[PDB]
């Protein structure tokens, strides 16, 4: 087993779930093991925002202050005086992993407890949003707050991006933001051939937690939805993007 | 001086022009010397395409065949049976330097002659588009077909991306494509500190020609536009990306 080999080579725990959406074939390795979801949750948060707003409603401008800025605000730190629309915030969140942009959106939908509620509504009994960003990245082993599983993240991302939890024009906006992610070049994208389109959202959290969730479109045929989640056993561990890239390679061979 | 030194270390000729758009301070070294432009011309070509089409017009699907494929077709080779839209062709050309994509775009705007006319229209009397890809990369010393200069490529890139040859929505498309280029990690990008956003387009051609053009954004300040061009004196010469990285570091210091 090639996933066991990766765990060995990288001294890490892997959580993998992959669904070929045209055949229902699956590739699983610890699919039901919890990990901190880290910023992957930003994608589910935008799915809920899109549920709750018309495309036009995304033009609402949000005002905020330096008080709303947190640890990492690459876009949001530029627009304190002009504000940013909900559409611009969704962009920043998904494409740059802008943590204040996530916090701003979470406030607009009613906060972590509200997000949790809406995830339950679409059938996700696993994913447990509790905190704002970046506090949700502090998860100790055994704890269930702000965790999910590779199977649940896959099932939820499919639900919003590809199934009927959103109407098509809204699915298209989510897919477009995720296709044009800036943060994921060394992860799932690195284990897929050039010319296979990828929409992804990365995450990093404590205990060397390193995650990528994605939709992958082969040149023909239906897409694959994948979660590659990882963690290590020391609290301040470093992660290695190559683990996710190599894991992706394994999945693609097993499905193809 | 430091550019001399790099020419001595890498046995090569360097063309450098850099403009700090905030101060109008400039850094130049052989700035009006001609070089084969190579695939840097891809950025300009998308500039022309964007100008001539609405954003919605980019969704027009182009059907192509194996005969449209040339020596390097990382994206276009995958979708012969489905075709690709003009937008997807622009993504392929800019982010992967897909040669067929550039040719297909060039056909849609009226060919090299018509691209020449449009560049003269934007104020570019230097750049001399004459051929398709890959043949445009074959330039012998002293010839002016398919050549430009560092000053002219900076002037033109700025006009499209930052000034008024395009409306902002189209500027955003071109800039985001160039920010997410996959081919330039070892060139200008490698001479700029991590975290500063960089938009770039690379090229390589005969006589060990190796080019990169870019916009570089300090975390705050107006952007710098930069062209680093290079050639060597044997026809079959190899180039070294490290020449381009090191030249860039020089420009950054010269501007600070």
UniProtKB/Swiss-Prot annotation, chains A, B:
Record's keyword terms, sorted: Antibiotic resistance, Cell membrane, Hydrolase, Lipoprotein, Membrane, Palmitate, Signal
Topology with respect to the bilayer: Lipid-anchor
Keyword Kinase on entry: no
Location of the protein in the cell: Cell membrane
Regulation: induction: By the bacillus licheniformis protein BlaR1.
Record flagged with keyword Lipoprotein: yes
Catalytic activity: a beta-lactam + H2O = a substituted beta-amino acid
GO biological process assignments: beta-lactam antibiotic catabolic process; response to antibiotic
GO cellular component terms given for this protein: plasma membrane
Residues binding substrate: 201-203
Post-translational modification: Large exopenicillinase is the primary secretion product; it can be converted to small exopenicillinase.
EC code(s) of this entry: 3.5.2.6
Residues the record marks as active site: 39 (acyl-ester intermediate), 135 (proton acceptor)
First-level EC class: hydrolase
A Gene Ontology molecular function term of the record: beta-lactamase activity
Family to which the UniProt record says this protein belongs: Belongs to the class-A beta-lactamase family.
More about this protein: The class A beta-lactamase family has a specific amino-acid numbering system, sometimes called Ambler or ABL numbering and often misspelt as Amber. A multiple sequence alignment was used to derive a consensus sequence and then the consensus was numbered taking into account insertions and deletions. This allows use of identical numbers, e.g. for active site residues, despite differences in protein length. UniProt always uses natural numbering of residues, hence there appear to be differences in numbering between this entry and some papers.
Protein name according to UniProt: Beta-lactamase
Gene (UniProt): penP
